[PDB]
Design a protein around this ligand. Structure first.
Ligand SMILES: Nc1ncnc2c1ncn2[C@@H]1O[C@H](COP(=O)(O)O)[C@@H](O)[C@H]1O
Ligand SMILES: Nc1ncnc2c1ncn2[C@@H]1O[C@H](COP(=O)(O)O)[C@@H](O)[C@H]1O
Ligand SMILES: Nc1ncnc2c1ncn2[C@@H]1O[C@H](COP(=O)(O)O)[C@@H](O)[C@H]1O
Ligand SMILES: Nc1ncnc2c1ncn2[C@@H]1O[C@H](COP(=O)(O)O)[C@@H](O)[C@H]1O
Ligand code: NA
Ligand code: NA
Ligand code: NA
Ligand code: NA
Ligand SMILES: [Zn+2]
Ligand SMILES: [Zn+2]
Lengths: 429, 429
């Protein structure tokens, strides 16, 4: 009553790592527990494809790429991931009349460039990609069910609106679970599931007349169709928490008439530039492509590894923030050059392989580093401290390789572990 | 009257529910680390006087696979030691026949052993311990056993392990793994810790006179020095279970005066050829180098993956056993070829990405395969059935790639998972 409740999944029969994640449904770090076995069903909101993507977009998709690699490569969860493409939107329609190429052709062009930018940043494609334009029929059926459950109504003009008041009345439903204080139509807060088509706009048939999906209904529809009635993880940037994500929860609860569609809602922090969110509207943005003419994938990923994913970060342009990233990337490149040369030039015939006190001290540091990094990853994917641990280990390996007689097997094993963590970070050396 | 075994406590340990065939219990028992997720592992190494053969490959490749499963798949932290017996009666005899120094012979065949391991994609251990570099430590180890009253000195300057005295202690049992395999000596079963050397043999100083280590003492000494008083895993071929490994247990228990030096003792089965152990003494052997002039590393590793590590296996020469290995290797090569090209040439601009029933069916089989393979690895490293599970999945992916419009992201994830399992098997495509 008056405050939304959250049900932690039961631990019996689940993979239990003791990972804690910052859950927006609880506004707290809570233990992450799969709904089933070691499986993670994960939906992440995708871009609206009418122009080039920028560094703020990169921060969200790279940060969740890192989290996905930690979940899969490091913890060995089984991740089934869906990302949508909003290729029907007011912005796409308006941009297409300006550009005088079909709306489909414009949306497809900027979707293609989005995925090329993701590939350039070594971001893994999701399991499924759901374009609104390929799901309109399913969206209509989804809305039909919400109406049948009495949680939406049809206006005279042919639009369909979600009935917030009817939804709240139900004891099993709470509206705006994540931002309770942020809250033709019955009430102003009602939001469109189906918009009657304006003249000259692209449109689709429905029982209520020609129209387009509303802003939020595609994500509930697509995630529900592929992933079902319980998502382990839903993600997006913090600006989407309300109204978009809270409205997705209400739509999906209305469709299934249950109380918890998402177990863990994860929200990345914004990249700021000169104190403000990097934003197309503010014209303060740097495109991913322009960033990539000056900096590499590794350097950009290090920029993001240095900042906790769920906190905001400041980007100082003109290379100021990238100085440290370039230095770190260079130290990793040089570390690999040196250790590979030491391994290559090692001669078993002329060496002595006695396990010395220096060998033992490096090994002790090595195993300790593994446990420190494990605790950092369990602590809500703390990559800044994990990256620091790798840097400290590399500093000691460099000292060891310069003076001590080297244990070839130990150096190889350390290199393989650092390779393993770098694969988890998405770095390529 | 029968040896007891203490299962490690589960509190605070990484618990995977892995079961392993433990020679100390003659049964499959749950594997539990002594500390956290750490595995201290000693494996007996070669005697370096001649070339390694396919039977040696079977043992070192099988335990390489187990190590990759433990590390890459389950994420245990393995600290592994392998010794090199570069002082031995066989080395001395061979070196006089060929008229070269004992060290020059041993370094040559140690070098060829590691080259053969690398050719088979076998990972080097953390530490490599040569007897010739540990003689001083062996002397100190023997001094302690004498001080604990479990060894005696003969008039000629040899030191023998005192089986009768060791057994008398209520905390010690002699021959824990093969209880039934049991003039100057007190009892015939007593075995040398230090052998008085003939003036023409290589020898080292000691409190008891010039001599050489006995046959078993080097392994207790080296493992105890580097890994300590409790090993999680000790491994070797089944012929070493007695007397060599049972004697290591007695020596190490006598040194530490405790009851369990090794928690899990793993013994690989022998590779036979025409019904008999592949053996230098029988002159029925195939060198690893000769095998690699006929078959690839992948094909040889598939041969071993097809046979449970702890069971004996028959090798039929003249290509008979390798027919199936070549076919499997060919099917993996052709699968990777197609999936890599389909991923590389996929065009996001022109495709349709609707998640169809065929996509869903392949995804269901994919996740199911992950669970089957997990159960096989937990079942005492059952690679034959995991390999079969991969083959079955590949057959369905090949059908999907031929007919259905392809989900690029699903194919990428399948490719990455199969790569992950092939990394765990040590296959390279
Ligand atoms: N790497 C993995 N692959 C597939 N299933 C897993 C994995 N790790 C844990 N599980 C599942 O997690 C549940 C409990 O994990 P555990 O108690 O660690 O065996 C079982 O249903 C297992 O099948
Ligand atoms: N400046 C930014 N920093 C971090 N994430 C952002 C930024 N701008 C947009 N995003 C996220 O990028 C994703 C796509 O943004 P949009 O295309 O605006 O829907 C959403 O999850 C947004 O929250
Ligand atoms: N991947 C890993 N890396 C380092 N330590 C681990 C790992 N998995 C489990 N552990 C350790 O195992 C003990 C208990 O495991 P758990 O209960 O799974 O956290 C703790 O001391 C953990 O640090
Ligand atoms: N035919 C064989 N099959 C499997 N393992 C063997 C075979 N011959 C020797 N080994 C193992 O290879 C390792 C080194 O053997 P050796 O070089 O004979 O001391 C030991 O663990 C032996 O048990
Ligand atoms: Na309510
Ligand atoms: Na908002
Ligand atoms: Na006894
Ligand atoms: Na034996
Ligand atoms: Zn969305
Ligand atoms: Zn040994």
């Amino acid at each position: 009553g008056s405050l939304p409740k959250w049900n932690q999944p039961s631990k019996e029969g689940k993979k239990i790592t003791n990972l804690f994640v910052n859950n927006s449904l609880t506004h707290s770090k809570v233990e992450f527990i799969p709904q089933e076995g070691n499986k993670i069903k994960w939906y992440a909101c995708g871009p609206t494809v009418y122009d080039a993507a920028h560094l703020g977009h990169a921060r969200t998709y790279v940060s969740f790429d890192i989290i996905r690699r930690i979940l899969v490569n490091y913890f060995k969860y089984d991740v089934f991931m869906v990302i949508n493409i909003t290729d029907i939107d007011d912005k796409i329609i308006k941009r297409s009349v300006e550009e005088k190429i079909g709306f489909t052709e414009l949306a497809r062009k900027w979707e293609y460039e989005f995925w090329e930018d993701m590939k350039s940043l070594n971001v893994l494609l999701p399991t499924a990609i759901t374009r609104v334009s390929e799901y309109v029929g399913d969206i209509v059926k989804y809305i039909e069910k919400i109406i049948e459950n009495k949680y939406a109504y049809v206006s005279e003009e042919g639009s369909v609106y979600f009935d917030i008041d009817e939804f709240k009345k139900s004891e099993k439903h709470f509206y705006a679970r994540m931002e309770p204080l942020s809250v033709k139509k019955k009430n102003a807060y009602d939001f469109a599931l189906w918009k009657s088509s304006k003249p000259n706009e692209p449109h689709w048939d429905s029982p209520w007349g020609k129209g387009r999906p509303g802003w939020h209904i595609e994500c509930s529809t697509m995630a529900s169709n592929i992933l079902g009635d319980v998502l382990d993880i839903h993600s997006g940037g913090i600006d989407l928490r309300f109204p978009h994500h809270d409205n997705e929860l209400a739509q999906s609860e209305a469709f299934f008439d249950h109380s918890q569609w998402v177990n863990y809602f994860l929200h990345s922090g914004h990249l700021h530039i000169e104190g403000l969110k990097m934003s197309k509207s503010l014209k303060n943005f740097i495109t991913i492509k322009n960033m990539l003419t000056k900096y590499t994938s590794n350097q950009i990923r290090i920029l993001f590894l240095l900042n906790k994913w769920d906190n905001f970060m400041n980007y100082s342009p003109n290379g100021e923030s990238m100085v440290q990233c370039i230095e770190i990337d260079k130290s990793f490149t040089n570390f690999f050059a040196i250790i590979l040369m030491k391994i290559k030039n090692f001669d078993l015939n002329s060496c002595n392989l006695y396990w010395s006190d220096a060998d033992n001290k490096l090994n002790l540091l090595f195993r300790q580093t593994k446990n420190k990094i494990h605790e950092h990853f369990l602590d809500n994917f703390n990559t800044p401290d994990a990256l620091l641990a790798i840097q400290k280990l590399i500093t000691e390996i460099n000292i060891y390789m310069d003076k001590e007689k080297i244990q070839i097997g130990l150096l190889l094993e350390i290199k393989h572990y650092i390779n393993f963590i770098f694969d988890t970070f998405g770095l390529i050396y």
